[PDB]
């Protein structure tokens, strides 16, 4: 249960199921209808974002390490600076997110704790 919970990915409603049996762990949002799924590497996840407790809003997200270290042009003085990739998931229950947001973090802390 703790390693699973449904969420919204890109306006679609699917299921977010965490895999703590890996290393680094992994998140997997699969559509409810089975149209598509998004996998997440809690390790690659630059950080974990989730709606605050004071906010009835039930949503969890995982940021991704970006390559902003470059931040340069192409030739016409333009601007590239690769944008960051974060996985946003909207939960329809603070209980799911509460059970999920804890899971991810429960593992994450192990990456630093193990760092």
């Amino acid at each position: 249960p703790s390693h699973s919970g449904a969420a919204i990915f890109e306006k679609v409603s699917g299921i977010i199921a965490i895999n703590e049996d890996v290393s680094p762990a992994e998140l997997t949002w699969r559509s409810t209808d089975g149209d598509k799924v998004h996998t997440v590497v809690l390790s690659t996840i630059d950080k974990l974002q989730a709606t605050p407790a004071s906010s009835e809003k039930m949503m969890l997200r995982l940021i991704g390490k970006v390559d902003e270290s470059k931040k340069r042009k192409d030739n016409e003085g333009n601007e590239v600076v690769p944008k960051p990739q974060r996985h946003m998931f909207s939960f329809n229950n603070r209980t799911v997110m509460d059970n999920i947001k804890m899971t991810l973090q429960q593992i994450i802390s192990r990456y630093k704790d193990a760092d």
């Binding site: 950080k47 974990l48 974002q49 989730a50 709606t51 605050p52 906010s55 809003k57 949503m59 997200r61 946003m88 909207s90 947001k101 973090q105 994450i108 802390s109 630093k112 704790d113 760092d115």
Partner: peptide, 20 residues
């Protein structure tokens, strides 16, 4: 279901270590 969310009140959860 046209628009009833809020991506402005989002916060970051506590995570050990800070390599920001």
């Amino acid at each position: 279901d046209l628009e009833v969310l809020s991506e402005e009140l989002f916060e970051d959860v506590p995570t050990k270590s800070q390599i920001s």
